[PDB]
Ligand SMILES: [Mg+2]
Ligand SMILES: [Mg+2]
Ligand SMILES: [Mg+2]
């Protein structure tokens with residue numbers, strides 16, 4: 039005594055909605071930049087500076103803050119393709135007016151990564167929006 | 172079915188280089204040469220292949236696979252072929268280097 | 281400390297024998313293969329240890345909970361005893377407390 | 378007819394692709410039969426021997442189960458008793474003759490049982506490892522792309538001598554797209570060879586890549602690889618297993 | 628690109644033969660052998676510690692143990708049954724529409740927020756859904772249909788000002804699960820159950836137009852909603868006149884888990900086919 | 916069985932009508948559901964006695 043059932047295909051486009059993406063949307067081109075949440079796309083060309091910064095898989099600028107031992111404050115610039123030494127020059131020379139003295143730096147050439155003492159997250163975000171990376 | 176005997180890859184550039192290459196510019200591109208023959212770009216896949224192929228057979232010499240991302244102007248290919256390469260070892264070179272009499276190298280292999 | 285007098289026949293090993301040439305072949309199977317099968321399934325071994333890891337206590341307690349009732353009497357016994365011992369030792373001893 | 382292969386996937390704006398000769402396998406003497414654009418994000422990636430190392434180990438170990446059991450003073454045959462009394466004998470006191478101190482008695486620590494080392498290197502890591510391996514096989518000039526793989530004959534000497542004419546070095550790993558589609562002359566000639574090997578690209582792997590002095594990739598194979606790997610810089614964190622139904626995904 | 632590449636032309640083959648892991652990756656283990664680390668092996672001298680038996684962790688050497696002198700208290704009391712609501716800031720929301728993860732065009736409930744990986748719900752941990760906060764209040768420019776389990780006044784305000792409609796809807800533990808990771812529920816292959824009614828204490832929260840509760844009387848919706856504007860001082864937009872109106876209007880049954888489906892159904896995703904019962908007792912069950 | 920239908924289910928040769936509760940299962944689910952989960956109206960009326968008693 040199995041109850042009767044009905045097979046129809048037209049309600050399947052509701053189910054279609056419920057499937058999650060396995061890859062990230064390319065963000066909608068707008069008429070107005072920056073956007074409400076503050077998102078600025080990288081330029082149509084890229085600068086000629088002998089280094090480059092890949093945006094995150096979220097198209098965000100790969101500058102993060104990190105601590106060690108709870109008291110050691112650090113700032114990490116990531117995904118950098120080119121001469122980082124140059125990037126080091128330019129970063130420390132950008133920051134030096136702010137602190138009166140060159141900020142401490144660790145360059146990792148194999149990692150393609152830059153590291154700097156203190157929290158410069160906000161200011162480095164801006165400074166990489168400047169050069170349009 | 173036969174096997175061709177190997178090349179030695181040992182390379183010296185002939186003195187006729189420029190003329191060969193420019194002949195290959197005019198013949199591969201099929202172009203009457205715009206005034207600068209060595210600065211014209213290699214970006215097109217067909218033209219690049221034809222170019223480096225004819226250049227491969229004429230000079231008896233080929234471009235390594237890494238280096239093939241690195242050729243864009245014709246000038247690059249020029250400076251590339253300008254460079255000699257020795258397939259002889261450090262050892263074979265040591266033998267031919269005019270050794271002092273008080274040095275005797277034996278090769279035990 | 282008396283040591284071997286005569287040289288042994290030098291063991292010659294081709295590293296080019298089948299199993300060694302073919303090592304680690306399907307390792308990337310999930311990734312390259314649009315994951316269906318996990319690297320796990322490339323693990324041929326003792327029933328309870330496939331695709332899993334643990335310290336001695338966990339191992340043992342696992343073998344018990346999986347294959348326990350298929351074990352021989354005596355091994356079983358030794359297993360329960362090893363378990364007890366380990367309980368006592370990990371919890372109740374150490375420098376680090 | 379020149380075979381000229383354009384990349385099936387977008388390159389980032391600041392980065393130009395790579396190009397490799399397409400060699401074919403029928404003539405000894407057909408060296409560059411064509412030209413292929415390779416994706417910079419797979420075959421030009423920043424070389425990192427660090428991760429090569431990591432994953433190379435992870436290949437070696439994670440399969441490993443060592444079965445070595447030694448017996449504790451509990452598991453030895455017998456000696457369920459104090460051999461002699463505590464006091465008065467005037468020799469060293471002992472419990473069971475299976476005290477690990479004793480000759481035929483237990484082993485204090487030693488190996489224990491079947492023991493597994495199994496750990497999962499995180500996804501995007503193994504991925505970036507294949508990436509690097511390939512980049513390296515290419516940059517050290519020892520990667521050779523092929524079209525076809527149609528072989529003139531099943532005589533293995535032909536193959537060996539081919540590697541001889543092209544100065545391919547001692548060992549070779551031949552990669553093809555699927556297990557079913559490998560032509561019969563390849564299978565024939567190679568299955569009777571030690572140094573050369575023949576594998577579906579589903580089993581391309583780092584260890585083997587380094588184990589063979591030359592890597593040789595079929596064109597459909599590369600167009601396949603490039604995609605499968607590049608998928609991962611652009612991908613979400615899985616919600617559930619990827620083997621399941623996804624919007625875009627197979 | 629990476630000039631490192633061109634350094635590898637120079638060098639010998641990368642093979643197994645030559646491999647060094649990153650310096651400082653392996654911090655080497657030491658073993659109590661030798662003059663330095665043998666002989667008492669950092670275990671000290673005699674006493675308890677050298678023999679490996681020192682007492683348990685909470686222990687003070689018999690003085691009444693710190694953690695035990697202190698009186699008990701209602702703290703973690705009934706912690707299991709205290710509801711939780713995962714917060715969602717408006718700033719994060721603006722973000723997610725901005726990068727076009729969740730698109731405003733079609734309706735937005737929890738499921739969509741999930742699939743954009745913008746939020747994470749662990750229903751097993753007593754998470755009763757997403758709740759709303761006001762963080763990007765001034766930032767917020769988007770016109771959106773949002774359905775959440777809880778929201779705060781200022782939040783409701785900041786969506787109104789832009790002309791979207793917010794509805795407070797509830798989900799029980801089970802239905803919430805079904806909501807968040809729906810595909811694996813389908814692959815479970817069980818019918819799609821009725822939705823619970825919120826518990827008794829929660830009832831007043833969902834019956835208020837104050838919260839725009841999904842179980843509330845729509846007759847007060849235009850009222851209290853307009854009220855929201857006089858308090859926060861802006862001109863209330865006419866939603867009925869808009870093009871996107873019919874999506875903003877879109878509601879669920881209090882008995883419906885998803886958009887477009889109904890209790891009792893079953894999804895076969897192999898045949899890409901929906902199945903509905905033609906039996907009466909079943910329909911009376913799932914439609915009640 | 917249910918799971919196997921979910922996987923393929925066409926080819927799995929699973930009886931479809933079996934993917935729903937029996938009459939017993941039905942009446943029990945019914946019994947418990949009306950038991951521990953009252954009516955919305957009924958819950959409002961359960962709340963009026965409380966609120967007025969506290970007033
Ligand atoms: Mg950290
Ligand atoms: Mg252990
Ligand atoms: Mg005994």
Ligand SMILES: [Mg+2]
Nearest residue numbers: 456457458459
């Ligand atoms: Mg006794």
Ligand SMILES: [Mg+2]
Nearest residue numbers: 459471472473
């Ligand atoms: Mg004793």
Ligand SMILES: [Mg+2]
Nearest residue numbers: 454480481482
């Ligand atoms: Mg014995």
Ligand SMILES: [Mg+2]
Nearest residue numbers: 453481482483
């Ligand atoms: Mg023994």
Ligand SMILES: [Mg+2]
Nearest residue numbers: 663664665666
């Ligand atoms: Mg000491």
Ligand SMILES: [Mg+2]
Nearest residue numbers: 667672673677
């Ligand atoms: Mg002592």
Ligand SMILES: [Mg+2]
Nearest residue numbers: 672673674675
């Ligand atoms: Mg003492």
Ligand SMILES: [Mg+2]
Nearest residue numbers: 713747748749
């Ligand atoms: Mg949480």
